[PDB]
Design a protein around this ligand. Sequence first.
Ligand code: PLX
Ligand code: PLX
Ligand code: PLX
Ligand code: PEE
Lengths: 40, 121, 54, 56, 53, 140, 70, 98, 347, 459
Amino acid sequence: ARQWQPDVEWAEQFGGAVMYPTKETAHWKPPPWNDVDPPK
Amino acid sequence: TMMSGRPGRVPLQFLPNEARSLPPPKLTDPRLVYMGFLGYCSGLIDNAIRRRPVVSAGLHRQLLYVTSFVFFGYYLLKRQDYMYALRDHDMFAYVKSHPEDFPEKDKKTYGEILEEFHPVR
Amino acid sequence: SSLLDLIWLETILPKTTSFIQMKMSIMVSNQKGLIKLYFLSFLITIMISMTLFN
Amino acid sequence: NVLQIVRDHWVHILVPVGFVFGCYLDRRSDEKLTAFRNKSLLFKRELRPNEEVTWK
Amino acid sequence: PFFDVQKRLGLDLDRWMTIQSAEQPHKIPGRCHAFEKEWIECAHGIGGIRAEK
Amino acid sequence: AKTLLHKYSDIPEGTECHRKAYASTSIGGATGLIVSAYSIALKPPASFLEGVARTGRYTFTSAAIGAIFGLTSCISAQVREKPDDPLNYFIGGCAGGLTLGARTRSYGIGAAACAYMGLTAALVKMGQLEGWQVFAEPKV
Amino acid sequence: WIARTFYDGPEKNYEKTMAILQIEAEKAELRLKELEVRRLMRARGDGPWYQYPTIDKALIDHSPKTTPDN
Amino acid sequence: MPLVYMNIIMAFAIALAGLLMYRSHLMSSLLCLEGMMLSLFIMSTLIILNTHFTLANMMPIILLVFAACEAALGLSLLVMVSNTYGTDYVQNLNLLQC
Amino acid sequence: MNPIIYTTLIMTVMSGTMLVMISSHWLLIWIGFEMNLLAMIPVLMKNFNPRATEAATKYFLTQATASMMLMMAIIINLLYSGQWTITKMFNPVAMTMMTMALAMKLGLSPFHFWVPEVTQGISLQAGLLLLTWQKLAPLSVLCQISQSINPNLMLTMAMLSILIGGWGGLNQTQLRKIMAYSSIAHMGWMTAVLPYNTTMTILNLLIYITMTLAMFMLLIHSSATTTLSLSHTWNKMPVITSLMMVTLLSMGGLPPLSGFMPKWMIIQEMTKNESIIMPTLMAMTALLNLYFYMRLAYSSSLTMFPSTNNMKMKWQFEHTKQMKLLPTMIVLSTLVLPMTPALSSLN
Amino acid sequence: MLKIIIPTTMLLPMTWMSKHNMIWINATVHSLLISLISLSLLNQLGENSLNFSLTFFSDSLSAPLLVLTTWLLPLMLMASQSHLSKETTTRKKLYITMLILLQLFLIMTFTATELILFYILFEATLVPTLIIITRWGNQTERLNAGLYFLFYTLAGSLPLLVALVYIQNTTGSLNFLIIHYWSHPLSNSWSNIFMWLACIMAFMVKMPLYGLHLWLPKAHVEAPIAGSMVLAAVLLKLGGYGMMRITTILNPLTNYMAYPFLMLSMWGMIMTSSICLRQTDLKSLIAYSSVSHMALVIVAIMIQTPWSFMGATALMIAHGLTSSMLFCLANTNYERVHSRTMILARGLQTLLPLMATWWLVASLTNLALPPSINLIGELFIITASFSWSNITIILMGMNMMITALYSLYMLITTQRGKYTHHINNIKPSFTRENALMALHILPLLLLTLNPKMILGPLY
Ligand SMILES: CCCCCCCCCCCCCCCCC[C@@H](O)O[C@H](CO[C@H](O)CCCCCCCCCCCCCCC)COP(=O)(O)OCC[N+](C)(C)C
Ligand SMILES: CCCCCCCCCCCCCCCCC[C@@H](O)O[C@H](CO[C@H](O)CCCCCCCCCCCCCCC)COP(=O)(O)OCC[N+](C)(C)C
Ligand SMILES: CCCCCCCCCCCCCCCCC[C@@H](O)O[C@H](CO[C@H](O)CCCCCCCCCCCCCCC)COP(=O)(O)OCC[N+](C)(C)C
Ligand SMILES: CCCCCCCC/C=C\CCCCCCCC(=O)O[C@H](COC(=O)CCCCCCC/C=C/CCCCCCCC)COP(=O)(O)OCCN
């Protein structure tokens, strides 16, 4: 009765570091929201 | 074609003097009308982006967009027509000066030409 | 309905293209970000271009 | 009420206007293809005493 | 691409350095002055293709 | 450079099976060496010996592909006695593709490779016959 | 009445088609001629097109050069 | 083309290969770039002096100056990289990837 | 940095590009390249953070190596003919070295590796400048020596650029990497026609710059740097997302959009030189760019993604600083196909 | 021809400056007026054409297609009225804008004196349809469907462009009249074979040819009602029109190249028809019926005889009308049941008798009952195929049989039997739906009076 729209499950497909994750890139983390890293 | 090296070309002129011997495009040229339409669309999109009444937010701004587009369009049309005139001029001059490379083909009628016939069966 | 239309006609044109382009995209974009490898490849390309195109 | 319903019914006028404008543009496009008027081998005709063109 | 400002305004920003045979200081000649002069006066105003051939 | 290609083209299509096979083997070896060099540069796998093992694997694979291609194409050409025929090249390409699948040891790749390689070899033969240019000179 | 009010005689369409055919045949001939002329000028270089630059001869210094043999 | 020019060319090629190898230590990359500059200077100077093309004697100086400035620029960048990691190691620059 | 210093550095970048364009001496072209590189580095690092510094050092290394190769080519060309004027390259591999140096400056494959990561490191204004203005000088130099170029090398690099851009863009969720791979593909298209007609190269560059400027200005306006951040934009400024989807379709080469004009013309030009296989491969490969543009359009405007509660606050504020020419850029990147024959102006 | 192009453009400002509650009325009225004006195009000559100008020309192959294109917009508006009621005024105006743009592009496509302009508008029709499918689509697969409908098409049409420009480099013109008058035979060669394939497969993908038809069930199932109508009625006929236009240059090569596709069609019309027998979805069944009919049209075009061309034209027009009406009926059921499954809602004749009569007439036309124009086209194609070869009749005959079966199957599963007990929200049919079916069906039974108006230029 309602037009389907994306949900969180569908949205998380575009949240990774890359599309099509593989074993080598499985440990890749998306960059910080602001382009700043901890100085460590 | 590469008319960049064409002799007697001033390095940075939009319109040479010899282009003034060609008829200027009319003010009701369809291309000028399309350029004005492009300006009007730019005005509408400007109104929409700033979150203003699209049709009737700034009429002075929309008029200025249309005027600028028509201005640049008229001058661009003049330059484009000039360039095509140059291309045709060089074409005809080279054909005239090289009669051996463009021989007159013999005129023949279909009554004495034998073309293969392929029936559709 | 099943064997040709939903399985093999789908396997031949669309799915093969999708799989091949996905594999090629993964291969091209899987770069470690190390300029060491990039400049070694640059050296290889320079030698190949000198040795092949003349 | 005139000048009040017009503000709400003015949109209707646009489509007919486009049609008459298109007819005018068709006639203008026709007048630029008159290079063979009354010169074809099939329809070559002598003008009437008060005729300037065969087709307009 | 190439915008020929020097030719349009007659500025000569860098043409003085392009060739050996163009007004060296104290009239010091290049080692191949005559050959380059002959090549230039051969190929002037003729175009690249005809000059190569 | 182009020397290998000239040695391959100098041989007639319907003669000298061994010469064509050897020239194709050399060309395949060169292609495998280049792809191995790029793979090693962009991906240092683990060490010197594993790298040279991977290089040898790729080189032998490509050399085998080229060898089977040339051999099968030339035998088909001689047997059929119809040179300048695209189908003979296609047969060689499919055979070459089949060999690649065998090295891989997966049936799916062999079928895919055979069709794709055969089509490509037939296209190359057609382009040779009709003079199709990949890198055309600037005529106009 | 329909023919009188809405349509026109056959001669109008006939002659308009003749004019259109003339225009487009001329355009096709001009296109072939342009391709041939471009090929010839680019191969030879004796026309106004494809004129690549050469060194200006007004740059050469014609004066004694401290050495008789230039 | 005598053997001196060819030796300078080979020196330039060796410097370029060393630059593109990147064992480690971006400072070595800068050193290879500066070796490339020096080979360019030597080759250009020999060419200009041999041909007696007087007005081009300015060219090496300008060359040197400009590329020397480039070196300064590179050094500054190196310093900041070190100040982020404590070392100028090449592999430390892997936050950005293709 | 200080606004006056930023203006001065930008003017120095533009002055370096103009010096490359207007000069007829190889040394002055090299000087212009050096000046552009020298003034470009602070612009990338205007916003200070480790990522920007790494991007700047990558860019410096690549551009310095390219400048050294270019000077090496100039020296060889002088050695084999005492000429400093930018004309016929007068030699073998000196021309090859010049071509490789200019390809590395442009980002043509296989020298493309620096573009995605340098674009990712820097901000969106820096990315806009890097992907638009930094292509004018090497392309002008290439247009000047187009007759010297060995067609095989340039066509190989152009085909590789198109293939690599198409394949690399498919894997990306970050918008700056998408723009970088799109730039690589469009560079391949631009250089694939240099051996045949430089007017087509300039027209492609102009259209690409217009579309890229519109895309980057839309990205900055709706300050999103990833796919999911852009997926929230419909809930605040849906007209921006609609314009962005239209511009994405335009960049994909779909008629009757503006992005169809370059490819079409380029293909046409090569068919005049009886090259048939290459244009077909180029179009079939540009299908990949169209695919990932369509994926971005799906995630952007054709579907409504989940939003957040805190977006409600954003509903109450407008943009203080507005970008002029953005409407003009969108219009010029979308609705200029009927004015196609204007390219005879030798744009 | 600008007398039709300009008003369709004026439909846009009229829509955007309308009331929030008067957009549908205004759009419907002015679309119907434009259709009435375009009725003028039907008058044709036994000679060449109606050459309006250097840019647009009309023929008796273009005229029925143009009339159907103009007529289809008001019906699309009427059917789109219902499911867009809860949409904001801006988005409803955007939907109407997409429909108007699509009509304008189709109108300019069917005149298209030059082949590159035809190609540009032919591929311009891709964008509004894609947005309609992927934006106002109910299911989650619409996005996937859109991708299919895009890339297939482009995969077929990117080579065509190359071929087209190549032709202009050799002949000098792509103007249809000069291409007709200056035609020359194509020699059998690898280059000519590939140029033939590049010219043909672009239009082969959109018919669609069996084996290249996969995008069609997806695009038809996942699109809204207006999208389905425009896809089945007109957008499938672009390939047939393009083949009729472009085959004048592919002879004598076409006879040699006909076999690979003819088989794929002659066997294909069997397979797809058989697929219609086992289908749990109405929209997929109607899509596969469209595939079968267009396969027969492909055969007719490839045979290349006057009877073939007349039959193909008549079948294209008739199939457009019939498939549009069938999709409308299925949508009226779907808007009540929300299921899109044939077996779920049954016995609808007892509940909705007039809609059952509409279903019967639509299925009878789909079944090719004489003397409907559907059977005129089918019969002309069958006679032409028999003249081509006497064995084709077997295949043709089987298809006819199979067609009848599934048609009546579709009528019996949904209309006859016992109603589903637990469905109690089947309200009586509105005047809107009944008028929609009437306006689909009456032109068919009126065109069966004057067949020569849809039989094409070879009549
Ligand atoms: C008993 C009668 C039987 C026949 C009935 C016929 C009725 C005809 C109605 C349908 C006609 C369709 C239009 C056909 C042509 C229209 C387009 C074009 O061809 O005509 C234009 C002209 O169109 C007409 O001017 C206007 C036609 C408009 C018809 C509208 C009828 C329906 C209106 C309904 C309004 C209802 C009232 C409002 C209620 C709210 C251009 O003609 P023009 O270039 O000049 O011709 C010159 C001919 N010359 C050169 C030989 C002199
Ligand atoms: C989206 C398409 C691009 C849009 C770009 C922005 C449009 C606005 C531009 C505003 C005006 C710019 C022109 C500047 C006026 C004087 C410039 C003059 O000095 O230059 C002349 C040249 O004039 C310009 O080049 C023409 C610019 C016009 C660009 C428009 C054509 C774009 C293609 C058609 C798309 C339709 C767009 C329609 C709306 C803009 C002389 O050039 P010349 O030194 O002798 O030769 C150099 C070129 N060579 C080296 C290759 C030989
Ligand atoms: C249920 C209760 C019913 C009660 C009513 C009973 C009345 C009995 C009549 C019912 C049908 C019997 C048919 C009897 C024939 C009469 C009509 C026929 O004679 O006219 C036809 C003529 O009709 C038309 O040709 C057919 C109508 C065309 C339909 C076009 C539709 C227009 C708008 C629709 C939109 C377009 C969508 C489709 C795109 C193509 C054939 O005439 P024709 O002998 O030949 O010559 C005409 C006159 N001449 C001699 C001057 C030349
Ligand atoms: C959804 C999938 C549909 C995809 C359809 C795509 C296939 C279209 C057919 C081939 C496309 C390219 C054809 C070439 C375009 C026309 C150019 C032309 O006519 O000129 C030919 C061009 O010839 C070629 O270039 C052919 C090269 C083909 C390379 C690409 C091959 C792709 C695979 C083809 C095999 C498959 C065939 C059936 C495909 C069906 C679709 C699935 C002659 O060459 P000239 O240079 O002019 O020679 C004159 C002097 N002797």
